[PDB]
């Protein structure tokens, strides 16, 4: 018998619901390699044109690492949290759903750490979170 805080990790999402979640994310993934470099170089060249530098607005994007996700959850700046269900030491995110329950932050248990990895250039990411999204997609967010 697994304990309650472990058995919570087995009622993962419905596949098609996860598919809407991911298709939503793929318009939001952060900047990967060979994109970072080109955007930054073009921005360096926009410096001489006074239209863009490193400091300028970035539209809302993902927040991957566990430390960052937990920080913004406990500051209640999260509107959606995803959680990979198969994490090597389960104690990494055994507490997390309880935190989301404490602060009313929506959270979901998806299958696979590999998918969250594909959501960046990295190989795996324990969690991701939408803090805010583009208004035009706010409703599509809110339904899910």
């Amino acid at each position: 018998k697994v304990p309650p805080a472990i058995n919570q990790f087995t009622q993962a999402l419905d596949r098609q619901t996860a598919t809407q979640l991911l298709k939503l994310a793929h318009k939001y993934r952060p900047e990967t390699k060979q994109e970072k470099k080109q955007r930054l170089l073009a921005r360096a060249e926009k410096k001489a044109a006074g239209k863009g530098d490193v400091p300028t607005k970035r539209p809302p994007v993902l927040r991957a690492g566990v430390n960052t996700v937990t920080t913004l959850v406990e500051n209640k700046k999260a509107q959606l949290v995803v959680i990979a269900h198969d994490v090597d030491p389960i104690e990494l995110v055994v507490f997390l759903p309880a935190l989301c329950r404490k602060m009313g932050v929506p959270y979901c248990i998806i299958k696979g750490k590999a998918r969250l990895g594909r959501l960046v250039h990295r190989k795996t990411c324990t969690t991701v979170a939408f803090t805010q999204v583009n208004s035009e997609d706010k409703g599509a967010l809110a339904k899910l």
Partner: protein, 203 residues
């Protein structure tokens, strides 16, 4: 901070994850070696807290040790000598099981230098430690001035000499009125200078 939650969790006990994932080692140290590399520090809490960074060049070896007293090795267990130096049942070794494990892993893997270790499980007749090890000849480590002290050869194999937090305790080393066995730097130095005569050139 996530690591605060992890810390508090490991501080607490009476959850079965230990029982689940201790067998995951007791079986595999008997399927594969009793001393084998792990690919990730199972407690990224404790590894980092001891001093660790997943930068390239860092290893952990998880190792089993067998626990108990230490029966004095003599033929048929009857030791010749005056009868206070008998006794082979209840003897107790003079270093922490953690330290024994540390030195076992270190002596097994040359070219890797110890940094510390920590506990991951204890079944009934065992102890499941793991050791953080540095590769002192990888450029990704040697080009980092914060931690290159491991490069220089004064620390060649720290663990047998006993400089690491695992075996330093057994040195009886400390500060105060509770350590006058070692007020010279070592249990042997604080002796060898206190039981020398002292003959000046003028008496």
């Amino acid at each position: 901070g996530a690591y605060k939650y992890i810390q508090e969790l490991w501080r607490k006990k009476q959850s079965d994850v230990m029982r689940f994932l201790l067998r995951v080692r007791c079986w595999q140290y008997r399927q594969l070696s009793a001393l084998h590399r792990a690919p990730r520090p199972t407690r990224p809490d404790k590894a980092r807290r001891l001093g660790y960074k997943a930068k390239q060049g860092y290893v952990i070896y998880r190792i089993r040790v067998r626990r108990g007293g230490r029966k004095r090795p003599v033929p048929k267990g009857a030791t010749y000598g005056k009868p206070v130096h008998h006794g082979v049942n209840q003897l107790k070794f003079a270093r922490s099981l953690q330290s024994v494990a540390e030195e076992r892993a270190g002596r097994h893997c040359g070219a890797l230098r110890v940094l510390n270790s920590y506990w991951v499980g204890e079944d009934s007749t065992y102890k499941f430690f793991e050791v953080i090890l540095i590769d002192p000849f990888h450029k990704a480590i040697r080009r980092n001035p914060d931690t290159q002290w491991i490069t220089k050869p004064v620390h060649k194999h720290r663990e047998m000499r006993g400089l690491t937090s695992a075996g330093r305790k057994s040195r009886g080393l400390g500060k105060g009125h509770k350590f006058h066995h070692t007020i010279g730097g070592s249990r042997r130095a604080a002796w060898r200078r206190r039981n020398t005569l002292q003959l000046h050139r003028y008496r």
